[PDB]
Amino acid sequence: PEMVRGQVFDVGPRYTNLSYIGEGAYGMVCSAYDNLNKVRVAIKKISPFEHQTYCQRTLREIKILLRFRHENIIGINDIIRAPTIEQMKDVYIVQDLMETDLYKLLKTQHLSNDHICYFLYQILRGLKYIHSANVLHRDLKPSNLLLNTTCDLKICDFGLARVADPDHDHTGFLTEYVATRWYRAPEIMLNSKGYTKSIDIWSVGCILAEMLSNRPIFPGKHYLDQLNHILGILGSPSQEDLNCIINLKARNYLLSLPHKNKVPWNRLFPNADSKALDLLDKMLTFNPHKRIEVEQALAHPYLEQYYDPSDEPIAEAPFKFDMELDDLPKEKLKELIFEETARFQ
Ligand SMILES: COCCN1CCc2[nH]c(-c3ccnc(Nc4ccnn4C)n3)cc2C1=O
């Protein structure tokens, strides 16, 4: 029973020599050596039983990963848990280990156009699969994109993922959101619950911009400030864009703002590929209905050297509907997690 960052990892003795990788609100990620497999792996400790919201997120993450199988998406190799519900205090997800992530890479390394193009293709390829399953990632950011030495890319962290619900997306002005702020689409702040696929596309665009400059494009200091940054670059929303916002609080705030003109991408990224800037423009579109879709993004001239529809697979068993996990108490949710993880025992 080794310890990391104050946390006890009951993964011994099959897994030994734990090293810290990252943290979350209710979980921790470590690397370890898999005795009898002769390889180093990644192990995520999850402790969601004390909170209903966490139990919902856990069941969804596990359910998705267990059904997903794709080169550009992190899979589950094993799941460690106590033999009984009474003894089950945490859940350990074992995954393949990746050398690093894009967050770590961008802090130190300048990316060549070839790398940017290749990284972006792999993200969209993975995302095509995700969206074909009727799933939304809802937390795509550099620290959630893993890399190895040969530049293979894998999407990780399906903790905030859900089945898409387009008919129940509308909401009020400045309603609270759990996803990372810098990669949050403008509509989250104004009228969206983030239940549509276009939410992931915005994030990818934010990632593409960051790959171009090694700096976040919309670095809001806080929740209120995030929209300030987006509008500062994109400029004032058009009449057409404004008519899709029917919540009066949101629309009236937008109308109350001074006129601002759009800042051209070539002024922010003067060294960037002109085709890359074109694709970035369609990803970072204010109106979520006008925003480019994953399959369209792949067919974009910027990625023409990788684009192969036959080699970009989709899911065999897409999720029919989102589970009503919200209502269920921390107790029934635990029992469902227990049953989902039973096969690995
Ligand atoms: C508890 O947090 C939940 C959210 N979350 C945080 C970031 C993360 N990273 C890996 C992972 C998986 C495999 N390899 C790596 N490698 C790696 C990255 C950096 N440094 N290294 C070594 N990271 C899984 C997760 C994850 O799911």
Q: What is the CATH number of the domain that holds 78?
A: 3.30.200.20
276 contacts 212 by C-beta, under 8 angstroms = yes
Q: Annotated binding site: which residue ranges? A: 21-29, 44
**CA angle 100–101–103, rounded 5-degree value:** 130
**Shared-domain flag, residues 80 and 135:** no
Q: Tell me which residue of 204, 274, 190 sits closest to 237, measured CA to CA.
A: 190
Q: Calculate the alpha carbon distances from 223 to 24, 169, 174, 218, 238 in Å.
A: 19, 20, 9, 12, 23
DSSP 150: T
**Whether the Cβ atoms of residue 266 and residue 281 lie closer than 8 Å to each other:** no
Comparing CA positions, the residue from 213, 209, 189, 211 lying closest to residue 199 is 189
DSSP 293: P
Q: Among 30, 78, 98, name the best residue to mutate to test ligand 1's pocket (greatest count of ligand atoms within 8 A of Cβ).
A: 98
CA distance 193 to 202: 14
CATH number for the domain including 320? Answer: 1.10.510.10
What gap in Å lies between CA 159 and CA 93, rounded to an integer? 12
Both 20 and 32 in one domain: the answer is yes
Furthest-apart CA atoms within the chain: distance in Å: 65
Tell how far the Cα of 255 is from the centroid of ligand 1, in angstroms.
Answer: 42
Sign of CA dihedral 317, 334, 195, 226: negative
Q: Do 51 and 135 belong to one domain?
A: no
Residues in the chain: 345
Q: Is residue 281 annotated as part of the catalytic site, yes or no?
A: no
Domain count, the chain: 2
The set of residues, in sequence order, having a beta carbon less than 8 Å from that of 270 and lying 6+ positions away, is none
User: How far away, in angstroms, is 44 Cα from ligand 1 center?
Assistant: 8
The three-point CA angle 287-230-113 to 5° equals 90
Query: 236 with 257: CB under 8 angstroms?
Result: yes
3-class DSSP state for residue 181? helix
Per the CB < 8 A criterion, the answer to whether 29 and 44 are in contact is yes
Domain containing 343 equals 1-97+329-345
CA 345-16-11 angle, 5° bins: 30
Q: Under 8 Å CB-to-CB from 319, ≥6 apart: which residues?
A: 64, 67, 133, 134, 135, 163
Technique used: X-ray
Enumerate long-range contacts of 17-25, CB under 8 Å, 24 or more apart: 18/43, 22/143, 24/159, 25/54
Same domain for 341 and 296, yes or no, is no
Q: Do 80 and 32 fall into the same domain? A: yes
43 in Cβ contact with 5 (< 8 Å) = no
Co-location of 126 and 158 in the same domain? yes
CA distance 206 to 186: 12
- Both 201 and 222 in a single domain? yes
- Shared domain for 7 and 120, answered yes or no, is no
The separation between the first and the last C-alpha atoms of the chain, rounded to the nearest angstrom, is 19
Note whether 36 and 177 are same-domain residues: no
Same domain? For 90 and 154 the reply is no
What does the alpha-carbon distance between residue 70 and residue 88 come to, in Å, rounded to a whole number? 30
Provide the phi-psi class of 86: left if phi over 0, else alpha when psi is between -120 and 50, else beta.
alpha
β-pair partners for 145: 155
Beta bridge partners of 146: 101, 154
Instruction: Give the integer Cα–Cα distance in Å for 24 and 184.
Output: 18
Are 235 and 128 contained in the same domain?
yes
Shared domain for 165 and 257, answered yes or no, is yes
Tell the residue nearest (CA) to atom 20 of ligand 1.
100
> What is the residue-wise DSSP string for 190-208?
HTB-S-STHHHHHHHHHHH
Residue of 90, 139, 157, 200 marked active site: 139
Q: Where are the alpha helices (DSSP H) in the chain?
A: 52-67, 102-106, 113-132, 186-190, 198-213, 225-234, 239-243, 248-255, 265-268, 274-283, 294-298, 330-340
Ligand 1, CB cutoff 6 Å, lining residues: 21-22, 24, 27-29, 31, 42, 44, 74, 95, 97-98, 100-101, 104, 143, 146, 156-157, 159
